[PDB]
Design a protein around this ligand. Structure first.
Ligand SMILES: [Mg+2]
Ligand SMILES: [Mg+2]
Ligand SMILES: [Mg+2]
Ligand SMILES: [Mg+2]
Ligand SMILES: [Mg+2]
Lengths: 151, 91, 63, 152, 131, 96, 188
RNA sequence: CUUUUAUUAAUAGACAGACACAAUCAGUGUAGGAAGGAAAGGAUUAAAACAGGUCCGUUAUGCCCUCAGACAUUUUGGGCUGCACGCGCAAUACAAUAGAUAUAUAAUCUUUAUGGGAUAAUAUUUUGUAAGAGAUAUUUGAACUUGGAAUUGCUAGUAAAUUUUA
């Protein structure tokens, strides 16, 4: 009879140990996870072939397994390498995109090696000074200027 | 010795009430009974728009667009005015 | 439509002078269209000669 | 011969140059576009004003072709730049060619007849305007706007 | 030059289907997921834009004398925000219109700077198709 | 033979005209008169040699008048007039 | 063939029921799209010859982020009047003139004095001041009811003019006129 | 001196001219006109005063101080920009009168934090003897839901908003 709207949905989904949830589109609901932004969320779903205008509550579990492999292995599905965060990274040398649990663990590990080398651009990031060419006369008084994450 | 006025930086802080409590959710899915109740009521109603039916049947406006589009695919009501701002469904 | 019965109809004659806290009110001479009379009263807005002013109470006076 | 008059009407920076010519069908062309399919409806509505105040019987069999222009000095990559200003220019110049044709190759007693109607409708349909942008003076950002001062 | 006699949105809506069905054009490798220029924010919402833009560019060369590659980028520019400071004007991407300019010379609708007679009898069907 | 007049004041370019128009047009050959619109230089400058008082600006200017003749003639018919009609303050660069 | 409102309504068949207000109530200027281009009508001491529809859209482009837009005003007034026409089966211009009359305040007070001893006096209102005060009231309740709500600008215009003309007291400008007519009465 | 109407492009055109409002000098209203009341906007600019600013613009200058690793001049690095904190002038914002996309009303989406862009990482790259300097791809995404006492500017194409050369 009527098929432009699904019969029933779901609310909360568990993917990569974050609670992506809601009656949102697959482009907007996948923007909850860090490491995945609004450009790359639309870029991955066109390769898997699932339509963007589909609410994530109604979805088949076989479609979920392609999603788990694509974000984990982004060079297999056919993404060009320009979308990655670590393009030619110093620790390895090959292109890889970061997902939350390895993402934070790689970032703080980069911060520790600058403490032993006393890299003056790097150690100001830890206490919270502005590393770029800003003038600190009459701006940013009570605030801190390190690396910032939500929650 | 005319006037001596001093102010503090403690006065410039704002006072606000904490938060307003959250509201219950609207429905986002179509039921079989929701299919029937929209078609009988729209045939009575003369000028129909998007906000009007969601304010009745508690529906979000994203699912109410297709309910108006499905009704005009039948010969019940017709879109009588359209601009970039607002479309008007009438008879 | 019930707000229309309260009006009384009256015609201004001429302007006398301006008087107010900052000179925003004017004094006028006005006669009633129902019966022959002569009233003096202050009005807020700017008027010219020959206007017809709507008023609620017709019995109050100035000075 | 083919009788033709050409009249100009202009605004702040806009220019309009119509041309009347005699054809059996009543037609109005704005950049070789029929006027009934114009997108800028304000430009369409002002021509729709003059088509109704004088009768279409009097404007029976004439052709008008209209070119537009904007003077140099400024360059604008934005859309919606010269919408209103060109519409008042073509409203002015088109009304000029109507009384122009009735004065040269038609009876003169009919010329002042429709002239009185539009002049009672609007005196400024046939004459240009004076108002422009006032130049900026130093010490402020605008013409009359002065910079905000503070003493404490 | 009777393209003025019809609208612009209806001339594109019919001609873009046959521009798909010709199947004589090459396309860039990732034209599905990219921005049209650096001034734009996101990728276009339409599933097809490489054909509809080719219908749009055929309006301009028909109404005008000659259309180069640099004149195409200026008509499709954008006004993007650079931050707290006010906006600035950018132009379109020169690489995407290059393949668009190459495909129509690979087909034969246009030559060196003008149009061919072959594309002219295609458009003359279209104007009488709408009316 | 494009020949031009470039001056600094209006009064000098006027008296050179009716002397040249009678001598060149009425006697030998035809010509064309052509006057160009003026070109203005603008140097907005601040007045005081300090930054103390109320800041005022001044605009200086310099104007150039241009009148050009376009003549096609025989060889010595124009060149006799250069030696004859040389006026005192004005420049007249002649391009044969 | 005569000039119509939007080629759908007519400048005729409307009439002002109030006698005092009818002089500055203008109907002579006819516009398919309400737009003005005369220097002579603008630069004038008198405000009698001004179109009411021209005065109504000028109360739309109000805030500083929204100033300078007449195209966005002309669209939302068109989608407004079509809903008023079908719902009421009236001329939509007829409910307009009943909206100005009912929401127009009748008399107001004046405060002369200072301090805890302040004299209050009740005076009357000129018809030129009654019109200008009435238009400013109506646009305010529109901008309040449509600021942070899913009602479009076209929707909130329609039920505002229908409730104010019908004296149904659930509108905005009728409630604000209720207290100011009460204040001038008790101060007398 | 600039803008506006006309036409031989350097010349006309406006005078409160006309009528009315009881005198002279005026002021206001209607009519004809491109322009009606200093046509609109600028520039020039009395006597006289200030212990106002300027010896860090001057091969303008009096007195004083300094005399060859000079209180001269040249070369290489570092500064004028630093960070607990008070103040003035400004640019984006707190969103459906909106955002993305586009054929710019083809069509579609977001129906409340997809508004907002600070801070920061990786990678390509421009100028320069020399980058914590400008530009590009992807990610991270703060405060902020209209602001206490108080106070600045503005009467017509003015305020306000969006663009544009040197
Ligand atoms: Mg001193
Ligand atoms: Mg030394
Ligand atoms: Mg020295
Ligand atoms: Mg600025
Ligand atoms: Mg955004």
């Amino acid at each position: 009879s009527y098929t432009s709207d699904p019969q029933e949905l779901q609310h909360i989904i568990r993917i990569f140990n974050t609670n992506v949830d809601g009656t949102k589109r697959i482009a907007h609901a996948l923007c909850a996870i860090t490491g995945v932004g609004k450009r790359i969320s639309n870029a991955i779903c066109k390769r898997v072939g699932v339509d963007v205008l589909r609410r994530a509550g109604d979805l088949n579990s076989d479609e979920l397994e392609k999603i788990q492999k694509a974000i984990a292995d982004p060079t297999s599905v056919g993404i060009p390498t320009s979308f990655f965060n670590f393009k030619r990274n110093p620790v390895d040398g090959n292109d890889v995109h970061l997902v939350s649990t390895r993402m934070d663990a790689e970032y703080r590990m980069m911060l520790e090696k600058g403490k032993k080398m006393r890299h003056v651009r790097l150690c100001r990031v830890a206490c919270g000074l502005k590393v770029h060419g800003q003038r600190s006369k009459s701006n940013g008084r009570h605030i801190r200027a390190g690396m910032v994450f939500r929650r | 010795a005319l006037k001596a006025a001093s102010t503090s930086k403690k006065e410039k802080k704002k006072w606000t009430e904490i938060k307003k409590k959250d509201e219950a959710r609207k429905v986002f899915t179509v039921s079989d009974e929701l299919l029937q109740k929209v078609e009988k009521e729209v045939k009575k109603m003369k000028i129909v728009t998007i906000f009007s039916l969601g304010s009745k049947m508690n529906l979000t406006l994203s699912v109410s667009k297709n309910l108006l589009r499905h009704c005009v695919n039948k010969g019940i009501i017709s879109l009588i005015h359209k601009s970039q701002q607002t479309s008007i469904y009438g008879q | 439509e019930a707000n229309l019965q309260q009006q009384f109809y009256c015609k201004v004659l001429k302007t006398a002078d301006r008087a107010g806290s900052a000179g925003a009110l004017v004094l006028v001479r006005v006669e009633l269209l129902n019966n022959g009379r002569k009233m003096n009263r202050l009005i807020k807005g700017s008027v010219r000669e020959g206007d017809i002013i709507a008023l609620l109470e017709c019995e109050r006076e100035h000075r | 011969t083919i009788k033709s008059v050409i009249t100009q009407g202009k605004r702040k920076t806009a220019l309009a140059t119509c041309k009347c010519s005699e054809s059996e069908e009543m037609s109005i062309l704005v950049d070789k576009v029929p006027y009934k399919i114009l997108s800028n409806k304000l430009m369409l509505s002002k021509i729709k004003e003059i088509i109704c105040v004088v009768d279409d019987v009097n404007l029976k069999n004439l052709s008008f072709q209209i070119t537009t222009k904007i003077k140099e000095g400024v360059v604008t990559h934005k859309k919606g730049n010269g919408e209103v200003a060109l519409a008042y220019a073509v409203r002015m110049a088109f009304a000029k060619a109507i009384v122009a044709y009735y004065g040269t190759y038609c009876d003169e007693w009919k010329k002042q007849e429709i002239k009185k109607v539009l002049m009672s409708f609007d005196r400024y349909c046939l004459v240009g305007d004076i108002r422009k942008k006032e130049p900026k003076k130093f010490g402020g950002p605008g013409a009359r706007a002065r910079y905000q001062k503070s003493y404490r | 030059d009777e393209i003025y006699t019809v609208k612009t949105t209806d001339f594109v809506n019919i001609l873009k289907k046959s521009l798909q069905s010709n199947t004589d054009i090459t396309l860039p490798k990732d034209h599905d997921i990219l921005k049209t220029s650096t001034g734009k924010e996101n990728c276009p919402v339409s599933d097809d834009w490489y054909y509809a833009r080719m219908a749009a560019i055929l309006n301009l060369i028909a109404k005008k004398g000659n259309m180069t590659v640099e004149e195409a980028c200026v008509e499709f520019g954008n006004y993007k925000n650079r931050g707290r400071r006010p906006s600035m004007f950018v132009k379109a991407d020169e690489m995407f219109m290059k393949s668009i300019f190459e495909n129509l010379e690979k087909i034969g609708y246009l030559k060196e700077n003008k149009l061919t007679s072959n594309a002219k009898e295609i458009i003359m069907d279209v104007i009488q198709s709408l009316s | 033979v494009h020949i031009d007049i470039s001056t600094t004041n209006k009064s000098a370019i006027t008296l050179a005209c009716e002397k040249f128009e009678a001598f060149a047009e009425n006697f030998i050959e035809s010509l064309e008169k052509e006057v160009l619109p003026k070109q203005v230089g603008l140097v907005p400058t601040l007045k005081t040699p300090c930054g103390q008082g109320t800041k005022t600006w001044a605009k200086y200017k310099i104007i150039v008048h241009q009148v050009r003749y376009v003549i096609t003639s025989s060889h010595d018919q124009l060149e006799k007039v250069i030696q004859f009609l040389k006026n005192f303050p004005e420049i007249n660069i002649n391009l044969g | 063939a005569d000039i119509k409102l939007f080629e759908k309504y007519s400048y005729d068949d409307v009439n002002c029921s109030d006698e005092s207000i009818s002089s500055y109530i203008n109907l002579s200027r006819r516009f398919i799209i309400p737009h003005e281009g005369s220097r002579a009508i603008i630069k004038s001491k008198t405000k009698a010859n001004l179109s009411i529809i021209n005065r109504f859209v000028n109360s739309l482009m109000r805030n500083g982020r929204n100033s300078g837009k007449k195209r966005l005003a002309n669209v939302c007034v068109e989608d407004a009047f079509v809903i008023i026409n079908c719902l009421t089966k009236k001329n939509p211009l007829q409910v307009l003139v009943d909206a100005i009359i009912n929401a127009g305040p009748r008399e107001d007070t004046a405060r002369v004095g200072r301090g805890g001893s302040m004299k209050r006096t009740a005076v009357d209102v000129s018809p030129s001041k009654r019109v200008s005060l009435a238009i400013q009231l109506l646009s305010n309740g529109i901008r309040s009811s449509a600021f942070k709500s899913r009602k479009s600008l076209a929707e909130c215009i329609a039920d505002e003019l229908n409730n104010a003309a019908a004296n149904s007291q659930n509108s905005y400008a009728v409630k604000k006129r209720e207290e100011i007519e009460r204040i001038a009465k008790s101060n007398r």
